[PDB]
From a paper:
Ryanodine receptors (RyRs) form ∼2.2 MDa calcium release channels located in the membrane of the sarcoplasmic and endoplasmic reticulum. Triggered by either cytosolic or luminal Ca2+, or by conformational changes in the skeletal muscle dihydropyridine receptor, these proteins govern several Ca2+-dependent processes, including the contraction of skeletal and cardiac muscle.
We solved the crystal structure of the mouse RyR2 SPRY1 domain, encoded by residues 650-844 (equivalent to rabbit RyR1 residues 639–833) up to 1.2 Å resolution. The core of the structure consists of two antiparallel β-sheets. An insertion that creates a β-hairpin protruding from the core distinguishes SPRY1 from SPRY2. The conformation of this finger is identical in both molecules of the asymmetric unit and its residues are highly conserved among all three RyR isoforms, suggesting it plays a functional role by forming an anchor point for other RyR domains or auxiliary proteins. The SPRY2 domain contains an ‘insertion loop', which breaks a β-strand typically observed in other SPRY domains in two halves. The corresponding residue in RyR2 (Asn771) is involved in a hydrogen bond network that involves Asp753 and His747, the latter of which is directly in contact with FKBP.
Author numbering: 652 to 683, 690 to 827, 832 to 841
Write the structure that this text describes.
């Protein structure tokens, strides 16, 4: 299991914050046991290093208390699966488009699948740190972030009040993979 993320970091501050609600999509270009989870993680989940260093771990989305993932059937956090429902329900597969929503004002993390709402969302979790889009996947799986911006246009309209993640570009994708 590998992971990818863009360099987009969203969070609370004491400055101007016209947008507290953030949206992106993931397109699944190819799927062939397997793993494919998408959602968000916080920098509070970084691994500590000597001298105060903190590093992204690149682990499975929802396999700790700092990340929040959807796989088509379940929501994941803290290594535990919650069952959710949707129309036409399936584990993620080729040509699925997953919408990911982060509402820092609620707080909530919620999803759509091929434009339809997933019934069940994350609530009652902390919003310490900065949040980033993130996906994790087993071998051979091909996915793309659609962040907004001319090279990653959305397939669906963001919900009212939501901003494209591309607007928070202060754009690169990082991929973490096992070495061995
Ligand atoms: Cl890979």
């Amino acid at each position: 299991v590998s992971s990818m993320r863009p360099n987009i970091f969203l969070g609370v501050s004491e400055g101007s914050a016209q947008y507290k609600k953030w949206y992106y999509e993931l397109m699944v270009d190819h799927t062939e046991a397997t793993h494919l989870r998408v959602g968000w993680a916080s920098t509070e989940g970084y691994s500590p290093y000597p001298g105060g260093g903190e590093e992204w771990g690149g682990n499975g989305v929802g396999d700790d208390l700092f990340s929040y993932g959807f796989d088509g059937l379940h929501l994941w956090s803290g290594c535990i699966a919650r069952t959710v429902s949707s129309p036409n329900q399936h584990l993620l597969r080729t040509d699925d488009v997953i919408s990911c929503c982060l509402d820092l004002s609620a707080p909530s993390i919620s999803f759509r699948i091929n434009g339809q709402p997933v019934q069940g969302m994350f609530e009652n979790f902390n919003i310490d740190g900065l949040f980033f889009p993130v996906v994790s996947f087993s071998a051979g799986i091909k996915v793309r972030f659609l962040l907004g911006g001319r090279h990653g246009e959305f397939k669906f309209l963001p919900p009212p009040g939501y901003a494209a993640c591309y607007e928070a570009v202060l754009l690169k994708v990082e991929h973490s993979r096992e070495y061995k």
